[PDB]
Amino acid sequence: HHWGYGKHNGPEHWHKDFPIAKGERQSPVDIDTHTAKYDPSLKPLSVSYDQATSLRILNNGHAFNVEFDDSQDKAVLKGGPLDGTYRLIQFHFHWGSLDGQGSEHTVDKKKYAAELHLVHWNTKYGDFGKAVQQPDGLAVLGIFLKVGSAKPGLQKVVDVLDSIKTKGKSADFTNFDPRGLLPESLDYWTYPGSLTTPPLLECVTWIVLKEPISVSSEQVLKFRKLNFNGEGEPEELMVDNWRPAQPLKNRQIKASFK
Ligand SMILES: [N]S(=O)(=O)[C][C]C1234B567B89%10B%11%12%13B85%14B%1158B%12%11%15B%139%12B%1061B%12%112C5%153B%14874
Numbered sequence: 001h002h003w004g005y006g007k008h009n010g011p012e013h014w015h016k017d018f019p020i021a022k023g024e025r026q027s028p029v030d031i032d033t034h035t036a037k038y039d040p041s042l043k044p045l046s047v048s049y050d051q052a053t054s055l056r057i058l059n060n061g062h063a064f065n066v067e068f069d070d071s072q073d074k075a076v077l078k079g080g081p082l083d084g085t086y087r088l089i090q091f092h093f094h095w096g097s098l099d100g101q102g103s104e105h106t107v108d109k110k111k112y113a114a115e116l117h118l119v120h121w122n123t124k125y126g127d128f129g130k131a132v133q134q135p136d137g138l139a140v141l142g143i144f145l146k147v148g149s150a151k152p153g154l155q156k157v158v159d160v161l162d163s164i165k166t167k168g169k170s171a172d173f174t175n176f177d178p179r180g181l182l183p184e185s186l187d188y189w190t191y192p193g194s195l196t197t198p199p200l201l202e203c204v205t206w207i208v209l210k211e212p213i214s215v216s217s218e219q220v221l222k223f224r225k226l227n228f229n230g231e232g233e234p235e236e237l238m239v240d241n242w243r244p245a246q247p248l249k250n251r252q253i254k255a256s257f258k
């Protein structure tokens, strides 16, 4: 009886195994755009993905992860609210059963069809597993997806999903360029928070881009054909793998833009 997203094991149950679920700096949150203060001390964000080396794509039973070789400083996030250098380890998405829900962060209560998370770890801690134990260990870049025109840069991901339909399946996935998933503007909100899945560790500087990317209905429909279950188990479609907004508590959301 492991955590997931259903009636009996979904987000409202996670606190029993992970009591930090009711903590002081949980994610996601609603971004109240009128209360987020512009902070002229924030820097432009520096997204340097030119040398990113993807390795593999995995269905882990709650999303699919595109994993990168993080053994050298190749794809890094710095600047913005961050001190130092954070290395890209993987990306994944959260999505809905329908286009009206799916994102984890909301914007004045607006839910997007999906949300992309590019996960990075602070190189001062040497590895991912050590970084998640530190309040400034991770930087997650959040990008909203709306349904409209196709994102050409997403198609290579969409087209491999039929090869990893079920939990535990993986496929080598080289030479994918994550620059093709970015919007035009790098205007962002930022706030201190957590992983949005168990273990829910309070180790994340969140950087959520204001500008959504557009993906096609066909693209997101292919996300919805994945399965939470393993091969030869009863089919449970991989949909609604999002945690709802959590209490902001004693936190300020800062905007990089006026
Ligand atoms: N949704 S999120 O806050 O970006 C959590 C991403 C992950 B990465 B892999 B383990 B590593 B740990 B667990 B697994 B994926 B979930 C948390 B992180």
Ligand SMILES: [Zn+2]
Binding pocket: 092, 093, 094, 117, 196
């Ligand atoms: Zn995520």
